[PDB]
């Protein structure tokens, strides 16, 4: 996240880090229950990657984190790597996470929910804080930012904006490399709800250009259908 700020430790308890088997972080994710994580299909997660829950500082020696194995990867079958549409993957964990004060789930919206353009939402992750930086930050970052209408978004991105996408930002902050898969949450009825999944944007992570997110309402039925069947 470019121009964001450090989060309070444990304040985004559903935020997970996807790491390879050596501990290298490449994408974010969100816990939606004890056995399942939602992330971006373009992250390219496999069953050798690991989910890390409860982390704040990746450079910390001591933190009580849970390193969970992935039993199964469910990539949405309509994902397309050129248009980057339907950018969503579900991970079924081989071992259930243990919820606690620093590890718990985000809510999912209903397919009919509506989040108005202009609402101030939040996105978190360990993505680059500058596109020219060599490494991802050790500490979780956060930024608040506005949602945009698809019509306003199209002013910046043209026909690249599809119905399963939602844009936010262009206000001094930006999701960036390594943030993908992480949450874009907005408050609904007292609870943070998952409205977007960090998906794509400009390779400079420009803060005057809107980031693009997978629109969870357009994809929640597929999520529910996959959870029911597996």
């Amino acid at each position: 996240i470019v121009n964001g700020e450090e989060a309070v430790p444990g304040s985004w308890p559903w935020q997970v880090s996807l790491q390879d088997k050596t501990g290298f972080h490449f994408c974010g994710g969100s816990l939606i229950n004890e056995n399942w994580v939602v992330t971006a299909a373009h992250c390219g997660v496999t069953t050798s990657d690991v989910v890390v829950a409860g982390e704040f500082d990746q450079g910390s020696s001591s933190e009580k984190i849970q390193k969970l194995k992935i039993a199964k990867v469910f990539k949405n079958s309509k994902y397309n790597s050129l248009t980057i549409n339907n950018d969503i993957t579900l991970l079924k964990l081989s071992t259930a996470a243990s919820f606690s004060q620093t590890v718990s789930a985000v809510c999912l919206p209903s397919a009919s929910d509506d989040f108005a353009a202009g609402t101030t939402c939040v996105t978190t992750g360990w993505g680059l804080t500058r596109y020219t930086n060599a490494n991802t930050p050790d500490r979780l970052q956060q930024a608040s930012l506005p949602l945009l209408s698809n019509t306003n978004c199209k002013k910046y991105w043209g026909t690249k904006i599809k119905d399963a996408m939602i844009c936010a930002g262009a206000s001094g902050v930006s999701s960036c490399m390594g943030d993908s898969g992480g949450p874009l949450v907005c408050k609904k009825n007292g609870a943070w709800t998952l409205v977007g999944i960090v998906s794509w944007g400009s390779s400079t992570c420009s803060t005057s250009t809107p980031g693009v997110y997978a629109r969870v309402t357009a994809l929640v039925n597929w999520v529910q259908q996959t959870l029911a069947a597996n």
Binding site: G10, S11, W12, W14, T102, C107, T120, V122, A191, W192
Partner: peptide, 13 residues
């Protein structure tokens, strides 16, 4: 779901 035990503190509302 979606209500952290440790409250987030944000600069932007």
């Amino acid at each position: 779901c979606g209500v952290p035990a440790i409250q987030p503190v944000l600069s932007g509302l």
